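Please produce the structure of this protein holding magnesium ion.
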Amino acid sequence: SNQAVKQRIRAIKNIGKITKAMKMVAASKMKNAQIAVEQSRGLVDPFVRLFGDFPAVNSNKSVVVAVTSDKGLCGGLNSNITKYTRATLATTESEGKDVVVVSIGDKGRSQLTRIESQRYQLAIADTYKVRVTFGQASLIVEELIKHNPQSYQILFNKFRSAISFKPTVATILSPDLLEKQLEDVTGNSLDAYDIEASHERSDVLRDLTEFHLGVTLYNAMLENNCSEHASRMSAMENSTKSAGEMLGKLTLDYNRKRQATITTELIEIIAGASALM
Amino acid sequence: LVPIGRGQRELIIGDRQTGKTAVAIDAIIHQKNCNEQVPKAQRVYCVYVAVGQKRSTVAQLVKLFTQTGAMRYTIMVSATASDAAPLQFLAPYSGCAMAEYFRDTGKHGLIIYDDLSKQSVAYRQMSLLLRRPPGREAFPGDVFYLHSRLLERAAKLSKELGGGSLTAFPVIETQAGDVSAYIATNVISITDGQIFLETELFYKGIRPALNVGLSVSRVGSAAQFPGMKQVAGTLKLELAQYREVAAFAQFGSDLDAATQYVLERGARLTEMLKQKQFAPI
Amino acid sequence: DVFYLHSRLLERAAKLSKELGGGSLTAFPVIETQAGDVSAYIATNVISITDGQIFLETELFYKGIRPALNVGLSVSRVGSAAQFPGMKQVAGTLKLELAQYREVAAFAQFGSDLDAATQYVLERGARLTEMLKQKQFAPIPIERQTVAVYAATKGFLDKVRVQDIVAAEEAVISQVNPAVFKILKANGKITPALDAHLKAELRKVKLPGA
Amino acid sequence: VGLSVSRVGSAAQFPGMKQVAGTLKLELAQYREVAAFAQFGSDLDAATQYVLERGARLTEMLKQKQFAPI
Amino acid sequence: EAAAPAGPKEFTEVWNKKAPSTLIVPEFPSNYTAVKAVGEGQVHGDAFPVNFYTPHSILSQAQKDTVVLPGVDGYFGVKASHVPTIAQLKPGVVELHSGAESEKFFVSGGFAFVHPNGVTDICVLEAATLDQVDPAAVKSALAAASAAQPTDEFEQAANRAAIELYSALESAVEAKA
Amino acid sequence: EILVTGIKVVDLLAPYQRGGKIGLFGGAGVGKTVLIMELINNVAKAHGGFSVFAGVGERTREGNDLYREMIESGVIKLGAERGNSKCTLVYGQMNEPPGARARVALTGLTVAEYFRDIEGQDVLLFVDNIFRFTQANSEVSALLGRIPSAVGYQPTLATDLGGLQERITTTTKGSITSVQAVYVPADDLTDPAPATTFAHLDATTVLSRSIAELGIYPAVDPLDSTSRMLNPNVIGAEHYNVARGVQKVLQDYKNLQDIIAILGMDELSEEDKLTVARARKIQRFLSQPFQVAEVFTGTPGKYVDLADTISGFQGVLTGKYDDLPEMAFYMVGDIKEVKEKADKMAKDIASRKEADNKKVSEELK
Amino acid sequence: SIAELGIYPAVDPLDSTSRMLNPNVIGAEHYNVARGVQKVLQDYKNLQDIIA
Amino acid sequence: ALTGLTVAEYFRDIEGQDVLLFVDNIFRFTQANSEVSALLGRIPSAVGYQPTLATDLGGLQERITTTTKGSITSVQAVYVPADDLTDPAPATTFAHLDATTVLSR
Amino acid sequence: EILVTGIKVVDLLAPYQRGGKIGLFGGAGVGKTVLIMELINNVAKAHGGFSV
Amino acid sequence: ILGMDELSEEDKLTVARARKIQRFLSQPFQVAEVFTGTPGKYVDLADTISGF
Ligand SMILES: Nc1ncnc2c1ncn2[C@@H]1O[C@H](COP(=O)(O)OP(=O)(O)OP(=O)(O)O)[C@@H](O)[C@H]1O
Ligand SMILES: Nc1ncnc2c1ncn2[C@@H]1O[C@H](COP(=O)(O)OP(=O)(O)O)[C@@H](O)[C@H]1O
Ligand SMILES: [Mg+2]
Ligand SMILES: [Mg+2]
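Below is the modeled complex.
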């Protein structure tokens, strides 16, 4: 029966080297996205210093977008924003608004279908296949724009460092229905900005909020990618420690089983010999 | 999946508490139902020998056999643990002699050696007390000849000698799924089949806990009911394709939506092979 | 007969009756362990004879926690509800805080999730672990021990991070009135007449940690 | 190569072979640590993959052909 | 009119009532920016700060004294205390000047903003520098653009954008210093 | 017939036969003797028949503690009232030489068999650590001119243990409910003395070390202890079906433990997180604070009725209490006290403070 | 373990050897494809700790 | 090694010096004593060793102490048989070792 | 008391108890014989004691 | 897995200190000067403690 614990040591040791390889993979790929996230952080400040930050608005129809990962080696990432989806979708509902939950990533449809399926319409997958590109963001934004909600909420994890992943709600409002309505403070705080558009303000704000949605969704599915590499890094160095301690315990049990088998089969020989002569 | 023909030594091996005795008793209980339907010539006369069992257990089984009516056809050779080790060494043999009368005179016999791993202990006691030198783990080397002299007596004779038969059912108790134990490794090579029962399947709902990857019968589909051969010929394949698709999906990694069906199809079959305590179908 | 060897050796450590002199005898058998296995032959023999255990873990000793008492596996159920009760007031709370620290240190083998109230447990346990450990050949009497565990199971020591408790224990031993030590020794327990003094003295402490 | 050692060492090695075998076993010792990473061939590090392909150069270099003494 | 008193600091207290208390409040993009709109000042002379942006890169964040935006009513220059502006830009060249040095960047179409604090936020998709563009295949690109004229309004819009973009590239490649 | 014991995991997963044998398999520090003292404190008072406690090679201090318990609890009455007593101790504890530990089980069995045969009443034979009888016989058998068998034991182990253990059974004239601790030697269930002892016990309750390492007391392994009364012909279908459900969930958790150890609960699917959450709740819920363990813990002991076991365990199997956390099921009596502890558990998470003033600790009172 | 994978006969493809596997005895085109099949099966065996 | 202890004891007690000793590979002294105690017909102990392992190793290691005359410091190379510190030869060795010095590659 | 052997690492980190026992976990080619010879030379040069 | 220039200033001073301590634990040995040329240096203990 001593052949089980040796092949189990063989299995756990190569699992340990697998995760010792994939911690290298994830911590490497966290850095090649780090030359792009702070660059993709460039267009997220002008819109919020222009439009403000107004999440808790009584929208009539709203598309909340919870962008998740592709491969399910996340480690406190996908289910985190899955619970954050209902936690930021429940404080916003007070009068029964239309809600269109959209999940980006293959690990979104596997988890968000359980809690909110009746308000679940779009599941965008294979988005981190090659890399993240802006025209992909424009296309998914247009596929949200086919419907005409009154607001948007974008649930994504802000990659600040390799330890802290605070999820964020990026807010995108409807241009004439709610965006210009929320700026009404003693007139309009937007009218001090002089328009330099072709047509009126009412259809340049449409272009502005479509660009805002596309930019912030691009930033969301880049920051979730970089925090996914960071969280797979933080999860593959716990599997390495786990397959280190499991290998240590199984090596101790292999040594104890080795000593027990050699002592028992030696006792067998001595009991066979002294009961003969 | 492991069909049992008349003249086959089929081993029922498990852990301490699996469905070992209860899957043997169902073979005796059902021989009340068949023998009230088959003619006189092809009647099966069961013999259940108890080696080293508790004496309250044997009084429960004769309570059970007289409760269902199986005692009309059953001899119950009890070598309880109160009996000395020269009795429990002998009682599988003497049970076979009481059963070989039915193989002598053209009828069909059935014998179930309960816990032959306690016959070897009662042979280990005398051989270590007659000063015979111990071999493996304490057993003398001829503990294979202990069982091979016994299990090879279960045979289906030829048609000039009466045409009788005698189906054995040796029962072996392992420790922790230790099929590499010395006593068990003798009997697995002797018997035609093997019905290996596992306890971690027994608590997962599979009752009888037949570890269906490890249960084979060398007599095979030549000796089964003809209606079940054409039908269940894909059954052992459909359980075979259940295990490796359940050996991959356990991580929570990925589904293929068609191998999800072949894992679902095996799940309608895994719950199909469960049976109750004393139920013959 | 190794079990009979250790049994007839250790079974003579008794607390005799009041008609047989009233004496006693306390054993301390020390069993060498190889790679920390409790499931040996000699270890599991002597555990089924002795009235308790004091498990000394190798990993806790390597990290500078000396003595390395594994408080999870170390049980002694004849001495609890037989000990000095002034210790036993705060010692049950100490047991709960050490058990909570064991549980949350197992739940956080690496620091990634912060709940800001479990961090109070992870601060208190690393404080108490630093309070309980000591230097070699240094006996501490029970009256200078009840005060040092009283001033740590409660507050009065969370002002240091974790570090200077090695100065803070000798600091609170020095800066209390040594009159209260005679009271806590002779009385046996923390009376409210001494509990209010113990709350009173513990806030004027010049603690070197800030 | 990771287990089979000569306790004499390179002191009685053929010179000229000693000029090259010390670098050979050094790259092979780096190879056996960077071994079991060839299955993640899509993920490079551009230097671990260089020593990985050089270990694949040298490990398939030392093959023999069944009573071919050189 | 504005009957929804939203906000990031108000969202904390309305998040504390329905969600369970064990979780930290999620963050907002207002916490990841410090250069605001109505924060008065931020001019300090002739150098006004310029936030030149791009989705995939950041090409300039240092301070300039003149930026010329190719607005749809024409190219117009941005000074220090410029007017608050929401300007949709034509596909053309932006002109980055810090003083005696002048660098010119061809932009592909995208908005540009000035806020009341004198800071600018130039927000364009593809900001191609004039050193990496060619003057050879632009005439072939216009010859492709001046050929395919079907009846679809979608193709008419994309083809007219092609003509205007390629003609702006020609005008911003032929007259170079 | 059923024997109601008032322990949760015992009455649910391996219920004791009133006319059978009861085994406790322990590995030096898992608490088989504390469990048998709680089994005494539950059963031997309500079960009005005579009881025989035969200590075979356990600690002498525990024998003296049992004597000082059974004197002041009215079980043994001394002086002029010796007739009212309900227990007879036979004590061959571990200081006695291995001749004397090899027969003191037989002495306690003869005292039980006189109450069975001649008196004709139902006897509770509480044999303490019957493995020490096999140990004393093995120590003798090295010198008796015999050959050593497997691991170190007697050649005549099986017939000796049978010749003891087939006396302790319930005849037509009397009944002996036998509760035996069986010390496993070195956490080694393949050892021939516990391997022989498994075949003689009607309702084996195996105590493990790993479950004790998680603090779950009593540390009964719920997946290896079983009975013959765990069958739907004697206990009704609801109890058997809830028992098979809780064993199914625990077996699935013990399957998932490997992937949980390597990867964590993050990698698992949501139905498997449901199974793991239910399994942790029913794994802590088998724990209870004992009435004999209150001398070293301060927690008051709780007797759990069989209907409350079936109510609470059926509820946590179906999902009536999925909202409650894990710690609400730790060291609790039954499902009323679970929600009572969930009230206490919630309450202290905020109210943790405010003791600075209005104390007696001013100087002048 | 090959028999449990259903391959009948359950011949272990790696550890089954022969002295008739020398290319100067049976010709080289047999030994080349045999060592190729052995190499491909050994790569699959080294990979099935990661495929698993 | 007892001859080595004798020449070291003459350099310690008579010459009054501070003597070094080098027991080369104490596991082979364990193996030689195991061979002479399996040779004479004594019943072998745990994993394969002599029954007199502890006392016939302590007969060697306990002449290696300080004395009021001089001292003997011995530097014994220790080899672990299966690289297992639960093995009884390093378990009975390491209860005498005072300072270990790991040499690395 | 301590034995000053002269090496910095075995006098600083893991000191040699004068009169005690020393364990070397050597190997091949790691300079164990050079370590032995230097220990002998240093102790015979300074402490006035021989070696065996 | 992160990079050489990644760590903070509180640690990389200790990285330099350990990388100059670990080479400082070496010593020229007098018995190896017959084929290394450099003569050995016997080090006292108090000098080792102070200079470390
Ligand atoms: N088909 C079945 N369905 C449900 N329960 C079963 C079935 N077969 C057996 N059991 C239960 O499993 C338990 C063990 O069955 P069985 O009597 O075969 O054990 P065993 O291995 O024979 O034990 P031993 O070998 O010690 O006698 C019994 O309590 C029985 O009620
Ligand atoms: N219900 C319980 N509550 C708390 N502790 C327990 C309980 N049952 C057993 N224990 C612990 O198990 C330990 C060993 O118990 P005991 O039965 O005396 O050991 P053994 O099983 O070796 O006789 C005791 O120290 C006790 O603390
Ligand atoms: Mg059976
Ligand atoms: Mg006990």
